[PDB]
Structure 1
C-alpha cells in the first residue's frame, strides 16, 4: 500500500477491528456481515460497468437485473433475517437505490400484514419470482406532506361491486413512487374512499396497472417515469393517472375498515404496526457520513500539497489544522450518529416489551424523538457529506472521489418519512405538551425530564458537557413556550400563534435532539471494555460536544450556561483534540469496514494507490471511447 497510508495505520493507538465489532453489535455480527458481503463480491452476476460510465437508461437496466438476481439469490441462500437482508442488499447495490425498494419494503410487507388469504394468493405469492412486481403509491403531484389533501378517489359501485379509482386532476396524479415508472405491474394506491355519498378518508387498494407478461399499461391506466433528478438515476420514480379505473371490491385492504357488498362502511397497537413505525434513516445518515469521511480522510492522508514550513517537503494535507477542523468534527459526528442509531434500535426493542406489558406511556416520546433525530441527523449528515467532498479539493468534484454519488443518493433522506421542518415541528408539539404538563404540576420523565428543572458548569468533563447541552435544550424549549404564550395571550388563534413561533419551535427540537446525541455518545463510553478504544472514542465524544458548543456559542452564552471565558477554553480544547485525533484518523475510518466496491471511490481506496488508478479510470470513461469526438467533424472541422 501507499507508504503514506501505512504510516498512518502504524501510528494508530488502538486496534480498529475492536471498533468494527462495536459498530456491528458483536464480533459474530461482523463475521456474518462480511460473509454475506463476500457472497456478492465474488459473484460475477452482481458485477457490471461503473454506474457513472452509463446512461440513465442503462443505469436503470443494470439496477433492475441486479435486483431480479438479488431476489433469486436471497431465496436460494435462505436469507430471511431482516438485518442480513439489509447487508445483502447493501452489498449488491453498493448504497445505490434500486427499483424493487418499495416492492420489497412496502408492497409485500403491507400484503403480509393486512391482506386476506385470497388476496395474498393473488398478489403476494406470484411475486416470488417477480411475476408480479408492486409499489406503494401515496404521494401526488399536489400533495406530499398534507395527506388529507390527497385527491385520488375510490368510489364504490354497488351494482358491480367494484371500486372506481380516479385521478380527477393534474395534481391528483400519483407522483414519485419508486418502481411505479417502469418496473411494477401492480401498485397499492392510497385514495379517499367514497361510498353511499360519504367520504371515509384514506384507504389502500391493490390496483393492477400493467398487463402480465407483456407489461403493457392496462386500459384507463397512464404510467411513466417522472424524469431525471439530482440523483437516483437507477430508480424509476413514477407517475400514475387512473381514468375511473375499476377493480374488484376484494382488492381493498380491509383489515381495519371494510366495505360490505352493499356499500356499507364498517368501523390497536401491535408488534405488527410497530415494524412500520420503525426507521433506519438515522443509521443511513451515520453510514453516509462515514463513507464520506472515510474517503476524505484517507485522501487527505494521501494528498500532499503546499507547505507548512518552507524547509520541509509538501506535507500531507491532513497536517493542516484547517483540514483537520473540516474533517475530524464530522468523523466524530459520524460516530455519534452510529451510537444514536443503535440507541434507537435498542429503544424499539424496549418499547415492544413495554407494549407487551400494556404500557403505552413512552409511545408519544418515541414518535417525537424519531421525527426529531431523523431531521437532526439527516440535515447534519447532508451538509457534512459536501464538506468532505470540498475538502478533497478539485478531485472531490469528479465522480472518482465517489462523494457526489453518496451525497446525491443520501440527500432526499431530508424529505423521506416527513419533511425535516415538519418533523421538527412535530417534535416541538410534544415538547410544548410536556412543558404545559410540568407547568400544571406534573413531574415528567424520559429524555425530557430536564423540563422539571425549568424555569431557567464544568466545561472540562463529559458530565459537565452533557449537562451544558441539557441546560441549553431546556433554555430553548422555554424560549419557544414563552414566545408561544405571548401570541396566544394576545388573543391570536392557537394556529396563528404556532406559525409565528415556528422558527423558535424548530430550534427547540434541534437543541433537544443535539442533547440526546451527546448523552447517548457519553453513555456509550463507560461500556467500552478495551481501554485504547475507549480513549479514542472519548476524544471523539469530547470533540463532538465541544464543537457543538462552539458552533452555537450564542445559545450557551445567552442562557448564561457557559461564560465568555469558557467559550475561549472550548475553542482552544477543540484545536488540541484535533492533533490528539490526528494519529488515529485513518484507523478510525478503516474501522467502518467499507470495501472499496461499496465506497465506489478511487480517492478513498483502502491501499491509497490513488493516482495510477485515477488515470486508468479516466481513460476508460465514455468520452474517450474514440480519440476524436464526432462533434469535431460536424462543427469544428
Structure 2
C-alpha cells in the first residue's frame, strides 16, 4: 500500500465501511453487492484484454459476448432482485453501456405487458432465449425531440391483411437506437398509422429485420451502424431504412388500439429517475480517481527547501476537488430519494414526479458532466491519458445530457410545472410537494446562519422563489406584448430554465440537509455535515448575485461564506481519501491506474504503457517510408 494512502486512511475521522452501508442502504446490501462483484471478478468468462488496447469492432464483440453470458449466468445463479441485477450488469460491463439493453429493458418487457395471446405464442420464448433479439426504433435522422414529426408510415393493406412499413425520405430513416445496427433481428418500430385514407398518429409495430439463424437482412430492410461516436464504442447505435416492407396485421401492438381485418381503426420517468443515480455514480468514480491520485502525486514546493508535498495540499487542488466530492455525496442522497419516491408513486403525484425526475435528471447530468472533466484536469498530464480512466468515464456518461430527454427540454418541463404551481397559488389554491414554498410568496427580517444546513436550505428556497417569480412575470409581460403564449414561452425560455435550475439546486440542498438528521453514526454525521455545508456554501459562493438580489444575503455575509469554504477545505483534507474509499469502487470498475486502491500508480503505469498496442513492435511499419 502506498504509504501516503496508508497514512491518510489511518487518521480518517470515521469508519468508511459504515458510510458504504449508508450508500448501499444496509449492511446486508453492501455484503450482497460485494458477493455479486466477487463472483464476476473471479469468473474467466467475464475476463478480457484492457478495453483501451482494443479497436471499436473488438470492443463491440467483447461487450456482446459478455451480455450473452451475463443473461445465461444471472439465470443460472437465480439473480432476480432488481438491485442484484443492476449490481451484476454494472460490474460485468465495467460501467460501459451494454448492447442488449433495449432487448432486456424495452423489447421483452413491452411484449410481456402488451402481447396478444398469439404474439405471446410466437415471441415470448424466442425473445427470452435470445433467438429473437429486439430493440425499439422510434427516433429518426430528422426527428429526435419532436416525435410528432416522425415520417415513418405503417399503411394498412386490407386485401392482404398486412401493414406496409416505409421510410419515404432520408430524414425518415430510423437513427440512434442501440442494438439496431448489428445485434438485433427484430425492432418495435414507431410509425404514423395510415388505414383507409386516414392517419391515426403514432403506433408501434413488431418488424422482423433480419433472418433468424443467418442474421442476413430481410428483403426491403437496409440496416447498419450510424458510425463511431465520442463514446459508446460497445453499442451498435443503428439506422433502419424500410422500403414498403410488409408485415402481418398481427404484428401491430394492439393492447390500446386496434385495426380490424377490414382496416377499421378502433380506439420515461423510470429511466430519468435511474439517470440521477448514474450521475451520482459517474461523479463519485471521477472524484475517487482524482482525490487518490492527488494524495499519491507530489509536485512543486510550498515551504522553500522542504520536500515536494502531495498536490492535495494545495488549496487550488482542494477547491477543484472537495466541492465535487460534496456534490457527489449530495447526488448519492438525491439518487436514493428519487429511487425510493419513484418506487412508492408507482395520481396527484404523476405531474410532480414527471417535473421532478425531468429537472433532477438534467441538473445532476449537467453538473456531473462538468465535474468529470474538472477531475481529469485536476490530474494534470496523466489525466489526459487513458491510464486515468477519466476520459472513458466522461465519453460514456456525457450522452446522458443529450439522450433520454435533452436537458434543456427537461428543464422546460420542470418550468411548465413551476409556472402552473405559481398560477395555482395566485388563483387561491394550495400547492404541495417540492413547490410548497410557493404558498408563502410575500406577493401571495430573516437572517442566514452559514453553519446551519436548515438555514442554508431556507436561503436556497428564497433564491428559487425569487427566480420562479421573475420567470412568471417575464412570461406574463411577453404574453401581453406578443399576444401568443408559445412565442412568449420561447422568449422567456432562458429565465424559465434558470428558475428550474435554482429549484433543483434547492431540492438537492434540502435533501442532503434532511439526510444528515437520519445518520446514526456521529462521526459519519459530522463529516457528511461538513460536505453538506461545503456543497451549500460553494453554490452560494458560485452564484453570489442570486443571493445578494432580493436581499436574501448581504455582501459581508458572502465574505463570510467564502471564508468558511476555505476552512471546510482544510477540515475535509484529512477525510478526503476515506470519503472516496467509502464509495467502494473496485479497481476494475474505476479502470484507472492513477486511481488504484493501493496507490501504486508509477510501476503499474510503466507496465500499462509497455503493454499498450503501439509497443507490440519496437519499429512501426511507417518508419520504412519516412525520408532519409
Instruction: Normalising by structure 2, report the TM-score.
Output: 0.98
Output the CA distance in 1 between the equivalents of 2:269 and 2:264. 31
Matched, 1:35 2:25: no
> C-alpha displacement at 1:278, in angstroms?
6.3
Distance 1:253 1:278, change over 3 A: farther
> C-alpha displacement at 1:118, in angstroms?
2.0
Q: Which residue of 2 aligns with 1:342?
A: 336
Partner secondary structure for residue 175 of structure 2 = strand
Q: Which residue of 2 aligns with 1:322?
A: 316
Which of the numbers 549, 555, 558 marks the counterpart of 1:567? 558
Partner secondary structure for residue 546 of structure 1 = helix
> C-alpha displacement at 1:233, in angstroms?
0.8
Contact 1:72 1:129 in 2 (8 A): no
Matched, 1:213 2:210: no
Q: Equivalent residues in 2 for 1:91-490 (5 A)?
A: 91-267=91-267, 279-352=273-346, 360-455=347-442, 457-460=447-450, 461-490=452-481
> C-alpha displacement at 1:99, in angstroms?
1.2
Q: How many residues align?
A: 624
Matched, 1:524 2:515: yes
Q: Which residue of 2 aligns with 1:625?
A: 616
Partner secondary structure for residue 163 of structure 1 = strand
Output the CA distance in 2 between the equivalents of 1:421 and 1:464. 30
Contact 1:114 1:253 in 2 (8 A): yes
Contact 2:272 2:361 in 1 (8 A): no
> C-alpha displacement at 1:276, in angstroms?
5.1
Q: Which residue of 1 aligns with 2:626?
A: 635
Contact 1:324 1:582 in 2 (8 A): yes
Contact 1:459 1:566 in 2 (8 A): no
Structure 1 runs not aligned, ≥5 long: 268-273, 353-359
Output the CA distance in 2 between the equivalents of 1:165 and 1:83. 38
Partner secondary structure for residue 583 of structure 1 = coil
Partner secondary structure for residue 573 of structure 2 = helix
Partner secondary structure for residue 273 of structure 2 = coil
Contact 2:152 2:165 in 1 (8 A): yes
Which of the numbers 578, 591, 594 marks the counterpart of 2:582? 591
**RMSD over aligned Cα, in angstroms?**
1.1
Q: Which residue of 1 aligns with 2:492?
A: 501
**Deviation digits for residues 326-363 of structure 1 (CA, Å, limit 9, x no counterpart):** 000000000000100111111123323xxxxxxx1122
> C-alpha displacement at 1:491, in angstroms?
4.3
Partner secondary structure for residue 60 of structure 1 = helix
Partner secondary structure for residue 193 of structure 1 = strand
**Deviation digits for residues 583-635 of structure 1 (CA, Å, limit 9, x no counterpart):** 00000000000000011000000000000000000000000010000000123
Contact 1:278 1:348 in 2 (8 A): no
> C-alpha displacement at 1:277, in angstroms?
6.5
Instruction: Normalising by structure 1, report the TM-score.
Output: 0.97
Output the CA distance in 1 between the equivalents of 2:43 and 2:117. 37
Contact 2:272 2:358 in 1 (8 A): no
> C-alpha displacement at 1:120, in angstroms?
2.5
Q: Which residue of 2 aligns with 1:270?
A: none
Output the CA distance in 2 between the equivalents of 1:591 and 1:473. 32
**Deviation digits for residues 197-249 of structure 1 (CA, Å, limit 9, x no counterpart):** 11111111111000111100000000000001101111110000000111111
Matched, 1:57 2:57: yes
Q: Which residue of 2 aligns with 1:83?
A: 83
Contact 1:488 1:497 in 2 (8 A): yes
Partner secondary structure for residue 207 of structure 1 = strand
Output the CA distance in 1 between the equivalents of 2:600 and 2:627. 38
Partner secondary structure for residue 20 of structure 1 = helix
**Deviation digits for residues 160-216 of structure 1 (CA, Å, limit 9, x no counterpart):** 111110100000000011110100000111111111111111111111000111100
Output the CA distance in 1 between the equivalents of 2:380 and 2:120. 53
Contact 2:186 2:206 in 1 (8 A): yes
> C-alpha displacement at 1:533, in angstroms?
0.5
> C-alpha displacement at 1:453, in angstroms?
1.6
Moved more, 169-178 or 436-445: 436-445
Moved more, 81-90 or 143-152: 81-90
Partner secondary structure for residue 212 of structure 1 = coil
Output the CA distance in 2 between the equivalents of 1:247 and 1:239. 19
Output the CA distance in 1 between the equivalents of 2:272 and 2:123. 24
Output the CA distance in 2 between the equivalents of 1:369 and 1:567. 29
Q: Which residue of 1 aligns with 2:607?
A: 616
Output the CA distance in 1 between the equivalents of 2:78 and 2:510. 39
Contact 1:292 1:389 in 2 (8 A): yes
Output the CA distance in 2 between the equivalents of 1:554 and 1:223. 52
